[PDB]
């Protein structure tokens, strides 16, 4: 109905009564349509009488028609006359002739049916598929009382079989007497008599073996009866039949799904649950473990009022026909839905079962039919789960009813969270440098097609068209007059531009579209790095916001000129790069001895280098007098001087717009400083990439973002102009080889030859020689690189591009000129040849072949890595959906300590290297104290660059800041604890989805992390909390490390200072080398602390958590992830990893239930844990002890309270099976659930405080108007 009356979405088992209450009929015949008239057939799968009419408002024959007969049913055909779209809504149901079991609750490991009934999965599969009988009832009373009468009968029968046995023995004796009489009365061979006698005694041995067979056949059956109890499986139906004919009463046995039905019927959940609870409480061991797992399914059917019966089906619901359409494709060729085949099979087998039971058939045929019906329902619900999948034409599996939901191509992920949209286009992008940062060229044809609903209206209003259809005709023929109207419609109507993949937020940005001539979207050069879009065919898509809210969001939140800083680290993303950096570096660089320079020589003439104003400087530049890169002194009267000269000449209130000063700089630096705002002081620095980035950072921090956008645009223009004028170009004469190359190659080939000799004399093995040669040639490559670096002039276009920060590193320059160096084996090792030639010299054939290995390996690795990083990003987004800013402040005292500078041994504070990503953009939780003095900066400060400067000046290192980890608010986090928003540059808003931003910021730099595990796999196993490969154990208690030296192992024993119970470590492998504890490596009998890693590598986060509480595992995780990301050279603020880590540590393991519905081993949320403790302290206190646990991103995501998000995340079938068993209601509170149900997400502009803002004119405005 309405997305506001959508408070909850409950899932549970659908009993047969519910299934036949949904149904509007029963599909009784396995038919779809008529072959000739091509109309729905009666009682068929597409029956019009059940699911409604194929045409709006008609009965099947035609008697009743049109809306005037709405809600009626024709008495001839029985079709209800209503809208045909109800065929997408009404369901049917097949009434199975015999019960079947839902496959989801049988095959899905763990078998929930088995756990409920305590039947082994093999036994359940035997019973359900008619391979073994099972006993469902036993009259213990009549068993007990007749245990003597039937004992008497069995004694009689045993006596009779023994009597025939002894009669057979006597017959043997008589025949043996005859045989011996024959043997010893007539003349025979000495052995022939013994041959026949042994033959006869062997016949009697066989007779006694038959007697033993009978004794077994009777006594085994009696024993089987004596222990006959319910839920006992009976293979070898011969024994079963003998039992039924003999002790048929005293026990009831069945076979198949109906037997499980009877078992569940005769199954009191309360008593079983109570017995299981007693067993888990009193017993222990593996028995208790199996008991506990069974109580996760036996409790679910108790806590809720759900029957355990929904597992066994008596009716199968039939999906509405239009969800499985039968369409007449062009050419008449009909196209089934692949589900009508499975339904047809089910109905055929059900009807055949009905007929077989009606006729009266031997149990073999009817049981085979029942097994087939069970298999058909299984295939309908899940193909290929048991046995070979049911295949259709072409030998392909039939798309079952569950395959529609699972996978990347399933329904939850291909049609609900991601959809195709109207009002969208795609085209190749071409750079437009004449655009402004908030503009994008939009091809005329694409814009006209996108906006044609609007253009039709406008050219009807202008009277260029008479009505809407005429206007549409003009648009379809692109009449010459519909282009100006287009320009009038497109005005200030933002369009979102997207480039797949959207690795982060700034991959969708709203631009004010401008019309361009042909077929290409003109993108601004600056937003390229935001999109990661270069112009070699990088198509991108354009979406058109329609509603007022959509336009407002595109214009305010997403405008490209509003998104300059990266949300990950806050560094500018729209700053100039490549050509513009080269242009600005060329413009602002100074070259001594240039034309027009400044010379102070006297005695013959004045300095003859000084200029009265920048206008005169540019006039001189026009003449061949003054270069733009020549040191001069100029009189400046419109650009503010730097802090030192300002404080000297002005001191206090230097008002620069009018005052004049002397600037000893180049003209290019003056021209550049004219691009920056008026308030910005003179820079007077060569503009490397780093310097430009720092300038833009400072500008964004101090000035409004509009000023930032305009300054950035002017910088782009100047950079392009002076990159054109820079004359950077490449030629084989601009690539200089080092002149000492041959001497170096000879000097190192001598060492290589010495190593080869040494190998030839057996001095060292193959591996050692390979390593030595690798080292030699590595040193050689280093030396030739140094020679090349020192040989190059500082003016060369190659080195100028590399060393101006524009692009490229010096390794590429060395590869181009000099020595490419060693090359990687296809396996991964280093080939020791090596490639001893440059790319300017040209590689030989074999050198090129050796080179190709690593390049192909890298191109395959890049694909696999982008896949892995995308998967990790998906997991990180899904885990932290529910972390969004809710409040402004917790007022929580708890905080995290950050070290900042480190005290020098001689005494000095050196700034910590990784401080920009740790302490910046954080809020102080506790006031800073310097030498027990006053406060340098108190709590509740953004802790920006001036703050850090002041702290380092004071002489204080550790400071307590507020972080999401120690955030007291329960739902999401708060603005203050989260801190400053890196993108916006100020305190975060009260609706920001910081979880999504954190996930995207962590997962975008992946695909640039060049994978102990040390790259993307390391981050993957850190977030997943998996035990690492290099499980390096850490100490448990402060003590002395009694170390040994073992063979194939070690023992890092430790004798504590608690003196308690010294623990030893296991077969710690010899390959793992010892760690460097503080300078001295771990020495035998050395005092270690509580956490000092003993062996090299990583320590599994779980152990460090168990040993040091949650805070130290938090620090360990953040430090390890940040170390992995720094090792490659990527900067991510610590707060994003902190958000993810916070999401990982939110649950507690239950050790003691207490007396409140808490299973041992259950992972329960800490907030709910505390709430239950508060509820239980009163009315009798039974504290349920618990212990912190570190989950992973996948486990933490799939444990959410919403089944709609967990199901759409991963393992849809398991999630839905468990949710159905538990009767879980989804409150529809996260972002994924709201997206799925198509209602406003509770973040950003959708929260309840911003959405229902009341807007009205101010009273004075109304009075004026």
């Amino acid at each position: 109905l309405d997305v506001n009356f959508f408070d909850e979405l409950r899932i549970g088992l659908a009993t047969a009564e519910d299934i036949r209450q949904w149904s509007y009929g029963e599909v009784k015949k396995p038919e779809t349509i008529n072959y000739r008239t091509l109309k729905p057939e009666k009682d068929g799968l597409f029956c019009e009488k059940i699911f409604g009419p194929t045409r709006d408002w008609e009965c099947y024959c035609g008697k009743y028609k049109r809306v005037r007969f709405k809600g009626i049913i024709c008495e001839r055909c029985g079709v209800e006359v209503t809208r045909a779209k109800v065929r997408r809504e009404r369901m049917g149901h097949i009434e199975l002739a015999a019960p079947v079991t839902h496959i989801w609750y049988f095959k899905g490991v763990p078998s929930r049916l088995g756990y409920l009934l305590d039947l082994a999965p093999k036994d359940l599969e035997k019973i359900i598929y008619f391979a073994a009988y099972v006993i469902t009832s036993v009259d213990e009373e009549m068993r007990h009382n007749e245990l003597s009468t039937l004992e008497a009968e069995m004694a009689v029968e045993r006596k009779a079989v023994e009597d025939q046995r002894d009669g057979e023995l006597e017959a043997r004796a008589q025949k043996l007497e005859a045989d011996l009489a024959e043997l010893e009365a007539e003349g025979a061979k000495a052995d022939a008599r013994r041959k026949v006698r042994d033959g006869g005694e062997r016949e009697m041995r066989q007779i006694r073996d038959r007697a033993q067979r009978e004794l077994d056949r009777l006594e085994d059956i009696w024993s089987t009866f004596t222990k006959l109890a319910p839920k006992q499986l009976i293979v070898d139906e011969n024994l079963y039949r003998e039992l039924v004919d003999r002790y048929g009463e005293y026990f009831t046995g069945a076979m198949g799904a109906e037997s499980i039905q009877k078992l569940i019927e005769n199954f009191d959940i309360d008593a079983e649950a109570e017995s299981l609870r007693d067993v888990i409480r009193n017993g222990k061991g593996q028995k208790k473990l199996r008991a506990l797992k069974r109580l996760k399914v036996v409790a679910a059917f108790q806590q809720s009022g759900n029957s355990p019966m929904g597992m066994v089906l008596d009716a199968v619901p039939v999906i509405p026909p239009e969800l499985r359409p039968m369409v007449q494709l062009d050419g008449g060729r009909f196209a089934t839905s692949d589900l009508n085949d499975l339904y047809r099979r089910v109905i055929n087998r059900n009807n055949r079962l009905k007929r077989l039971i009606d006729l009266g058939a031997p149990e073999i045929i009817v049981n085979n039919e029942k097994r087939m019906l069970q298999e058909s329902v299984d295939a309908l619900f899940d193909n290929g789960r048991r046995g070979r999948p049911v295949t259709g034409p072409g030998n392909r599996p039939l798309k079952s009813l569950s395959d529609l939901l699972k996978g990347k191509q399933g329904r939850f992920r291909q049609n609900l969270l991601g959809k195709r949209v109207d009002y969208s286009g795609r085209s190749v992008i071409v750079v437009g440098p004449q655009l402004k940062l908030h503009q994008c060229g939009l091809p005329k044809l694409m814009a006209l097609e996108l906006f044609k609903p609007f253009v039709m209206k406008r050219l009807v209003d202008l009277n260029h068209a008479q009505n809407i259809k005429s206007a549409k005709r003009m648009v379809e023929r692109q009449r010459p007059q519909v282009w100006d109207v287009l320009e009038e419609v497109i005005a200030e109507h933002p369009v979102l531009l997207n480039r797949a993949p959207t690795l982060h937020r700034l991959g969708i940005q709203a631009f004010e579209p401008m019309l361009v001539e042909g077929k290409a979207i003109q993108l601004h050069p600056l937003v390229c790095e935001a999109f990661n879009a270069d112009f070699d065919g990088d198509q991108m898509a354009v979406h058109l916001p329609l509603s007022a809210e959509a336009q407002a969001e595109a214009r305010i939140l997403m405008l490209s000129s509003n998104n300059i800083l990266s949300p990950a680290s806050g560094r500018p993303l729209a700053m100039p790069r490549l050509d513009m950096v080269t242009g600005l570096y060329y413009l602002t660089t100074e070259v001594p001895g240039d034309t027009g320079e400044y010379q102070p020589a006297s005695g013959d003439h004045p300095e003859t280098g000084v200029y009265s104003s920048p206008a005169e400087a540019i006039m001189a530049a026009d003449r061949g007098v003054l270069s733009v890169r020549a040191k001069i002194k100029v009189r400046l009267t419109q650009l503010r001087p730097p802090v030192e000269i300002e404080a000297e000449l002005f001191g206090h209130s230097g008002w620069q717009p009018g005052d004049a000063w002397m600037a000893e700089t180049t003209l290019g630096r003056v021209m550049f400083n004219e691009l920056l705002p008026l308030g910005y002081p003179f820079v007077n620095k060569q503009m490397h990439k780093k310097v430009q980035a720092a300038i833009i950072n400072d500008l964004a921090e101090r000035y409004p973002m509009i000023v930032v956008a305009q300054t950035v645009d002017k910088l782009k223009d100047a950079g392009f102009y002076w990159a054109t004028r820079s004359g950077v170009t490449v030629s084989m004469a601009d690539v200089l080889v080092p002149p000492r190359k041959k001497e170096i190659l000879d000097h190192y080939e001598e060492r290589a030859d010495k190593v080869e000799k040494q190998f030839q004399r057996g001095a060292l093995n193959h591996d050692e020689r390979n390593e030595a040669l690798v080292e030699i040639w590595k040193e050689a490559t280093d030396e030739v690189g140094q020679a090349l670096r020192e040989h190059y002039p500082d003016d060369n276009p190659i080195i100028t591009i590399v060393d101006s920060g524009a692009t490229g590193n010096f390794t590429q320059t060395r590869t181009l000129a000099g020595m490419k160096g060693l090359v990687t084996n296809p396996k991964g090792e280093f080939i020791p040849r090596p490639v001893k030639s440059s790319f300017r010299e040209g590689l030989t054939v074999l050198e090129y072949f050796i080179n190709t290995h690593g390049a192909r390996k890298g191109l395959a690795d890049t694909a696999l890595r982008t896949a892995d990083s995308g998967y990790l990003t998906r997991r990180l987004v899904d885990v932290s959906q529910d972390v969004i800013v809710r409040e402004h402040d917790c007022q929580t005292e708890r905080g995290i300590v950050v070290e900042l500078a480190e005290r020098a041994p001689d005494g000095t504070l050196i700034r910590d290297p990784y401080i920009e990503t740790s302490a910046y953009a954080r809020t102080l939780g506790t006031d800073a104290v310097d030498e027990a003095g006053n406060v340098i900066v108190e709590r509740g400060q953004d802790l920006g660059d001036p703050e850090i400067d002041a702290l380092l000046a004071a002489g204080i290192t550790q400071v307590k800041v507020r972080s999401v980890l120690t955030c007291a608010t329960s739902t999401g986090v708060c603005a203050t604890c989260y801190g400053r928003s890196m993108a916006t540059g100020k305190l975060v808003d009260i609706g920001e989805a910081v979880g999504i931003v954190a996930a995207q910021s962590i997962g975008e730099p992946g695909t640039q992390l060049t994978m102990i595990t040390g790259g993307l796999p390391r981050v993957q196993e850190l977030f997943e909390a998996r035990v690492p490969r290099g499980k390096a154990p850490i100490a448990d208690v402060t003590g002395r490390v009694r170390l040994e030296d073992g063979e194939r192992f070690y023992k890092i024993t430790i004798v504590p200072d608690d003196g308690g119970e010294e623990v030893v470590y296991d077969k710690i492998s010899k390959r793992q080398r010892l760690r460097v504890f503080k300078e001295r490596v771990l020495s035998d009998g050395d005092h270690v602390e509580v956490g000092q890693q003993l062996m090299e590598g990583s320590a599994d986060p779980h152990e460090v958590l168990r040993v040091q509480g949650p805070r130290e595992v938090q620090i360990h995780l953040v430090r390890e992830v940040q170390e992995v990301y720094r090792a490659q050279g990527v900067s991510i603020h610590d707060k994003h990893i902190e958000v993810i880590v916070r999401q990982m540590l939110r649950r507690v393991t239950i050790i003691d239930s207490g007396s409140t519905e808490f299973l041992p081993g259950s992972l329960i949320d800490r907030a709910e844990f505390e709430a239950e403790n508060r509820r239980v302290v009163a009315e009798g206190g039974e504290p349920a002890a618990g212990r912190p646990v570190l989950m992973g991103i996948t486990k933490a995501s799939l444990a959410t309270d919403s089944w709609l998000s967990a199901a759409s995340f991963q393992e849809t079938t398991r999630v839905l099976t468990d949710a159905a068993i538990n009767c879980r209601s989804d409150k529809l509170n996260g972002l994924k659930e709201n997206v799925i149900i198509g209602k406003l997400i509770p973040a950003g502009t959708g929260i309840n405080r911003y959405r229902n803002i009341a807007v009205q004119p101010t009273e004075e405005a109304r009075a004026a108007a």
Partner: protein, 107 residues
């Protein structure tokens, strides 16, 4: 595009809830004591038997009760036997079987 169709069609006709044809809800009762309402139009005799949502036919619950008759059980093994054998030989075989069993029990 392959451009398929579900057959049937669409009909934009301004939905009316005001002037609607008169209806007479008719109750039917199945075998398993389940009532079922059916909105038939007044200008048509209410049928005496409806295949209800239950999946089994139900008669009208008012009086009437026409109670028709249908063909007896389509066929039967005995009937098929009587189309290839007569009574006298079947009786003779029954006597042979009876005497055989009597000899088995008492001789």
């Amino acid at each position: 595009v392959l451009r398929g169709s579900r057959l049937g069609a669409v009909s934009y006709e301004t939905d009316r809830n005001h002037d609607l044809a008169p209806r007479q809800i008719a109750r039917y009762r199945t075998d398993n004591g389940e009532e079922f309402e059916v909105p038939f139009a007044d200008d048509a005799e209410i049928p005496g038997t409806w295949l209800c949502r239950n999946g089994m036919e139900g008669t009208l619950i008012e009086g009437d009760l026409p109670e028709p008759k249908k063909v007896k059980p389509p066929r039967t093994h005995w009937d098929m036997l009587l189309e290839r054998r007569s009574i006298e030989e079947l009786e003779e075989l029954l006597k042979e079987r009876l005497e055989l069993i009597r000899s088995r029990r008492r001789g």
